[PDB]
Design a protein around this nucleic acid. Sequence first.
DNA 1: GTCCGGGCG
DNA 2: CGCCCGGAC
Length: 238
Amino acid sequence: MKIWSKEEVVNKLHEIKNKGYLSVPTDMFRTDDGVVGQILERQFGVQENNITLGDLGEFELKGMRNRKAKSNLTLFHKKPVAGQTVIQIFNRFGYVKPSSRNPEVMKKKLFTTIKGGRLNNLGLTLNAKHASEINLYYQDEYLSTWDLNLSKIEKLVLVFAETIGRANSPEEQFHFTKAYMLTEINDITSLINDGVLVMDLCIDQDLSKSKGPHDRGPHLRIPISKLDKLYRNIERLL
DNA sequence: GTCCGGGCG
DNA sequence: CGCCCGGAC
């Protein structure tokens, strides 16, 4: 592994921006929301991976399309350490509904965002005692517990991309024009309980096939506009 | 299974 | 917010 210095990342970010609109290699394309991150990684010599640690060693690289109304930032994924498994949660709380990409394909899905401080429409809520104990409830019924390690996200290099082309098309292109370094992470307990940091469940299954469901891992997520509640130091790198 | 990379109206 | 995907090993 290469552990990057800040100077080397800043130099690399400038190089990337200066290239302008980058394409999706034919070998990489797979109708994938995450291609923005795949491209940003490849520009940094980071190959596709499922390693837990920050992919630049001292930093973790995150790429996002510069949408006017942005999706939340996915920080990392983590299964519960205790209680109901995610598939058990899917079995119970999942629902049968056509694929949103191909309406001729029926899925069972659980795509839900769970927050502390309130119940969502499925009745699900979080209560954090500490970062090491975040509890999932259905109403007053305990379900599962997460113990989250945030070492991968201690230092983020967040990079925003302007786009041309239709979203998730082969012809989509990305110009990385802005980047921030976020460091000095706060404790997440309050952030869970105040509804700032959220957990997404993202599980689905093609019910015409005899595959099991695809659990993409419970996502810890944060809106970009609340990153200042998670990190006390934000630096404009690009 | 358990992580990685990210979306929409 | 309710709701949503593509991968790796």
